[PDB]
Design a protein around this nucleic acid. Structure first.
Ligand code: MG
Ligand code: MG
Ligand code: MG
Ligand code: MG
Ligand code: MG
Ligand code: MG
Ligand code: MG
Ligand code: MG
Ligand code: MG
Ligand code: MG
Ligand code: ZN
Lengths: 178, 83, 116, 57
RNA sequence: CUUCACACAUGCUACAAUGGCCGGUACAAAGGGCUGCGAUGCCGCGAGGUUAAGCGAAUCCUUAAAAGCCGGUCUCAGUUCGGAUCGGGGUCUGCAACUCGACCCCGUGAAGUCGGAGUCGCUAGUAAUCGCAGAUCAGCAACGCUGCGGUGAAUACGUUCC
């Protein structure tokens, strides 16, 4: 019964309404889905992502991700169409709320030399993206049971129509900007 | 002179050539040979034509060159990559 | 058991393990352990959460460690570079800066032999 | 498809060194999860050449 | 006179466990000292600062030799090996330490895991290894030179070949 969800529904919905003069409650922005992918590169090389990405994204998120295959071929990357190059998961619902809480509260601060995520990394419509570099701060995975380290990037899709609205929503949710 | 019992070292002829001008104006280039003088927080804004062994080079003491020597901004040797 | 980095190499005594902090050597580690109260002859494996929390605050209380120290060092180098001093000029040229000999040595400031 | 695909996802307990304690449902970690730093203690959430010359001399 | 795409030569330090670090502790010779040596005491983590006994010296200082011995720890790792490079802060000599001094403290922790063709020294208190002293000298020599002692080997059938 995700505490971030109730805190949203309790204070953020009318705080955003006070900030932007929404004449209809249906206009209040909210986060609809959260997408995480690894974007592996060792597709042509060593052909191993079954555990490098799947068997840890399972741990970070809670559901098995999807394996993505190259849409075309590029010679400068030795990439041949149809082979696994990325692993993506789509968090949505209370699992998404719980993942957002578990990220902002205990994972994001644990980043070494963390000084605050940029507030300029919005898409221009209200959607925010940022990346990591390792199987760190998620306590769910153990470094004692990982192969080579690898990062990820996270997309936070919102119903906001502008970057300022999205930034206000994420600031209220607890994303540390600078 | 490079020991915290005697303070910094500036040549007296350099000090009395800057302190009887800075009191009124930022004097133009002070032709000098005293490379061994450390820059004190009074040479600010001035300019010195420091000898390098063959000619004088203008150096503008801005803010951060306040612990170094006049010679450090007047390179003596010329090397330009044998080939 | 992390301070800033992992700092828990497998089965290391605490005084040696602390040196893996970028900004702590043997002397700094010795005074850290002496100040907190943890003995040097103690493995990093057997460290408790309260011991870790004691030695955590005391490093940013006094010392300077990964990140900000690494920023300050390159800040000093860059300041020397754009102030236009002799040492900064040698930093740009990739040559030894503390008045060493460049006729037959300086194989660390310069890379391996280039064999003209 | 939800038969034997997704890992375990059941109620857990987060406890921090400072003391900020809450609870959600995480993965394989069975019960309590102990953390050293959180959003309630970590910094960034809680906040001269001439000067050096003169203080030296 | 100290430059630096390179090349050669002579050395020092290493690549570690016959070792590194920490604690305790034993055993030298030969030399230097009035524009000098500074014992003691006090301050400093330290380089050092200050007072100052004695001493032109078999009587004072230099003077703690280090390898060695005992105990503890490290457990084969580019490491508690190695100590280059670089950042910060200092001491002293000197009118003056940027070019271009030595040393100290904190941090930094590179190449290097025994070295191709080839090549060098050594037959005994020798080689190997460990410290100490002097000259020059304001300072720079604990990588050079000239000396001093400590520990202390393996081999030589023989003259075919170089
Ligand atoms: Mg010469
Ligand atoms: Mg060592
Ligand atoms: Mg000893
Ligand atoms: Mg004392
Ligand atoms: Mg080492
Ligand atoms: Mg190597
Ligand atoms: Mg080895
Ligand atoms: Mg050979
Ligand atoms: Mg001398
Ligand atoms: Mg040598
Ligand atoms: Zn906390």
């Amino acid at each position: 019964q995700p505490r971030l969800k109730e805190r949203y529904r309790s204070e953020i919905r009318d705080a955003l309404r006070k900030q932007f003069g929404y004449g209809n409650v249906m206009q209040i922005p909210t986060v609809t889905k959260v997408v995480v992918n690894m974007g592996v590169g060792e597709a042509a090389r060593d052909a191993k992502l079954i555990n490098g990405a799947v068997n840890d994204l399972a741990l970070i998120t809670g559901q098995k991700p999807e394996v993505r295959r190259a849409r075309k071929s590029i010679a400068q990357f030795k990439l041949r169409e149809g082979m696994p190059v990325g692993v993506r998961v789509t968090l949505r619902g209370d699992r998404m709320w719980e993942f957002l809480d578990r990220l902002t509260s205990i994972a994001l601060p644990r980043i070494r030399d963390f000084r605050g995520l940029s507030p300029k990394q919005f898409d221009g419509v209200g959607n925010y993206t940022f990346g990591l570099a390792e199987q760190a701060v998620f306590h769910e995975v153990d470094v004692d049971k990982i192969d080579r380290v690898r990062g990820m990037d996270i997309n936070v899709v919102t119903s906001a129509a502008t970057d300022d609205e999205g930034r206000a929503l994420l600031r209220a949710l607890g994303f540390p900007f600078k | 002179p490079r020991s915290l019992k005697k303070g910094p070292f500036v040549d007296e002829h350099l000090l009395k050539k800057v302190d009887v001008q800075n009191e009124k104006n930022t004097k133009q280039v002070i032709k000098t040979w005293s490379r061994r003088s450390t820059i004190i927080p009074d040479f600010i804004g001035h300019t010195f034509a420091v000898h390098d062994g063959r000619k004088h080079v203008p150096v503008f003491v801005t803010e951060s060159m306040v612990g170094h020597k006049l010679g450090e901004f007047a390179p003596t040797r010329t090397f330009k990559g044998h080939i | 058991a992390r301070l800033v980095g992992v700092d828990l190499p497998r089965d290391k005594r605490m005084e040696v393990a602390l040196t893996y902090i970028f900004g702590i050597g043997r002397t700094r580690s010795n005074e850290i352990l002496a100040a907190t109260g943890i003995d040097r002859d103690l493995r990093t494996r057997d460290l408790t959460e309260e011991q870790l929390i004691h030695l955590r605050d005391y490093i940013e209380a006094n010392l300077k460690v990964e990140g900000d120290l690494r920023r300050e060092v390159q800040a000093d180098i860059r300041r020397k570079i754009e102030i236009g001093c002799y040492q900064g000029l040698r930093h740009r040229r990739g040559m030894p800066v503390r008045g060493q000999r460049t006729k037959t040595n300086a194989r660390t400031r310069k890379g391996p032999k280039r064999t003209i | 498809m939800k038969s034997d695909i997704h890992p375990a996802y059941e109620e857990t307990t987060v406890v921090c060194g400072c003391g900020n304690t809450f609870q959600t449902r995480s993965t394989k970690p069975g019960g309590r999860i102990v953390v050293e730093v959180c959003s309630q203690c970590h910094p960034f959430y809680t906040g001269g050449r001439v000067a050096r010359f003169e203080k030296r001399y």
